Design a protein around this ligand. Structure first.
Ligand SMILES: O=C(c1ccccc1Cn1cncn1)N(O)CC[C@@H](c1ccc(Cl)c(Cl)c1)P(=O)(O)O
Ligand SMILES: [Mn+2]
Lengths: 373, 357
């Protein structure tokens, strides 16, 4: 029985992970839960339902609303990871909260089932340095597919990695059409991922993660638009053979595989039914209209903290768009402007502080680009 | 540098295999060539162009010439691309020497069955068919206990989606050369499903067939978690040939890969087994076992030849297979020798001609 710590337990990935674990008590036992703090109601139900009292809340003010959370405030999730004996740490925390628990999980020797994108994109080689071969197992559909498809040959036999992309809500839109796009049109409803999916920045992040997880050069990582999202990614080998992973969209599949790696979890998700006719479409990404992916490749080839800069510039430009300060195509315009000025940030991140410094620099630089304009 | 005997060197597989070898001298060395005899013109051209004098139809002549070539030649890989019963004996000989058997000859498995499997150690037979090659690759996607289903793709032939009525008027020219006909009738897939059960040990009820007209995905494995792993490539037999020769190592530049710089779509649909029962009949014959699969194949051969001669309609090809198998309840017994296999086939051929009359 594998002891699992679920970080970011109240989001979509976390709840689905708990469902997989609840369905499979023979293979998994939850030994810890952590939440950012936005969905304290969910976490308290999770404590009541799992009987797990080993729980953390990052938001100090949210935790004080309850008064009996064992780890709270600054680095609560990291401390839970450091102090809990576990076989697997699932990291589905949001944004910046993910990095230090990723590093803590890796130092414990546990398998890291990684859902948090910022960890790898921002942390880069800082994170890779902390890991042994095979210790990081990806939770993202695309990277899970790749990991599975890579079993099709040896590393020297790999020619290309092909990521599929839905294309988002603006697939087939003109550059002129995007000028008028509103946040709500992108599926975003401002508050105290859906936008990054619309801008294709999410796909650029996945390209960076692909390079870091699997060690394949950026010019051998392709993106293909596949609106059905049935094929989740593919690997082309040196002999001409492509191996692909397919399933009806259901995140419980890649979540189960990361938890149970390398053993598959029986009945995790429904398989492709070929009793109905279906048609799977493939088309090139319109790189003229959606340059986010090529910009990610650019940041990634330059290297080091440039990927933290790419991500941080995106967050700030995206927030400006949600605020109504800039238009939609300006998001990737600002990312490009920030990277062009980021010559000091190609260095490898030596410490967590290097990452946070790069991110702070990038945000301020994006703010300057936003303000004028 | 692997030493390769090519049996059936003048046919399609044989010739593509030699091109693969010639392109990879550091990986491969041809140490022997064999052919039926009808294609002597190209066989002697193959001698002059490869410098191989170890040939069988000249040191080796006769019906057993290919077997004797295999027994006396030191070889790591024997590619058996002989068509028909010509391949059965050389299959056993190659297996006996301990060499890897890259199998393209459907008969030795479909007819031979247990006879061939008992002469082989696990992993000695490496399949050359694109569908089986695809499954072998996709099975790397999990461990044996995690396999839920093997899924073979079928082009569906020229009569994809036609009605039973539409089929009655089909001419030899419309159906596309027996290999081509076997694709039109879905008997090819029937034979591959039988071979799949035999090569991989998966029960017939977990071997599915799906129609995929593009022939890009060559087969898939669905695992117990809901994941399916598929193998895709533009159709080119040099890919599964190269892999069967270099197993488990891939051969750089064997075939062109899928290019996604151009838009395409891949269609999947069920086979209407009311209109195309060839695969279902293959499952039945397979489950019965013994000499029943030899009967399936033999009856097809005669029914197919009768269609190509204008004697029966297209739908009658599989109808004759069903008839012959329905009378073959005597043949659900395990074959003890090669002659037991040939007996069932002679019987099937004769009972098939009866139906044609
Ligand atoms: O890989 C392929 C293959 C697939 C597509 C194109 C060429 C090849 C190579 N090829 C071998 N023999 C003849 N061609 N096959 O294994 C052929 C079987 C399938 C098939 C499919 C389309 C056609 Cl036009 C024909 Cl004739 C046969 P099927 O109908 O059993 O699926
Ligand atoms: Mn994704």
């Amino acid at each position: 029985r594998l002891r699992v710590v679920v970080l970011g337990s109240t989001g979509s990935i976390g709840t689905q992970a708990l469902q997989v674990i609840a369905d499979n008590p023979d293979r998994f036992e939850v030994v810890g839960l952590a939440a950012g703090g936005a969905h304290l109601d969910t976490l308290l139900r999770q404590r009541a339902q799992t009987g797990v009292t080993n729980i953390a809340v990052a938001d100090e003010h949210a935790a004080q609303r309850v008064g009996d959370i064992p780890y709270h405030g600054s680095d609560a999730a990291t401390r839970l990871v450091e102090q809990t004996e576990a076989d697997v740490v699932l990291n589905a925390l949001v944004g910046a909260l993910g990095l230090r628990p990723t590093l803590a999980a890796l130092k414990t020797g546990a398998r890291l089932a990684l859902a948090n994108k910022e960890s790898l994109v921002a942390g880069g080689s800082l994170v890779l340095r902390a890991a042994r071969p095979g210790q990081i197992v990806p939770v993202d559909s695309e990277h899970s597919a790749l990991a599975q498809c890579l079993r099709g040959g040896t590393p020297d036999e790999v020619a290309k990695l092909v990521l599929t992309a839905s294309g988002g809500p603006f697939r087939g839109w003109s550059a002129a059409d995007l000028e008028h796009v509103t946040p709500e049109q992108a599926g975003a409803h401002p508050t105290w991922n859906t936008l990054n999916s619309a801008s294709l920045v999410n796909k650029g992040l996945e390209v960076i993660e692909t390079h870091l997880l699997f060690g394949i050069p950026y010019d051998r990582i392709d993106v293909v638009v596949h609106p059905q999202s049935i094929i989740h990614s593919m690997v082309t080998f040196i002999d001409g053979s492509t191996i692909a992973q397919a399933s009806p969209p259901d995140m419980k599949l890649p979540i189960s595989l990361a938890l149970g790696w390398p053993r598959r979890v029986s009945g995790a998700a429904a398989a492709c039914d070929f009793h109905t006719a279906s048609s799977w479409e493939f088309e090139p990404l319109d790189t003229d209209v959606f340059p986010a992916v090529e910009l990610a490749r650019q940041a990634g080839v330059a290297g080091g903290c440039m990927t933290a800069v790419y991500n941080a510039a995106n967050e700030e430009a995206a927030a400006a768009f949600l605020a109504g300060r800039i238009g939609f195509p300006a998001i990737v315009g600002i990312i490009a402007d920030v990277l062009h000025a980021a010559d000091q940030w190609a260095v490898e991140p030596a410490t967590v502080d290097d990452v946070l410094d790069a991110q702070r620099w990038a945000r301020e630089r994006a703010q300057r680009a936003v303000s004028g304009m």
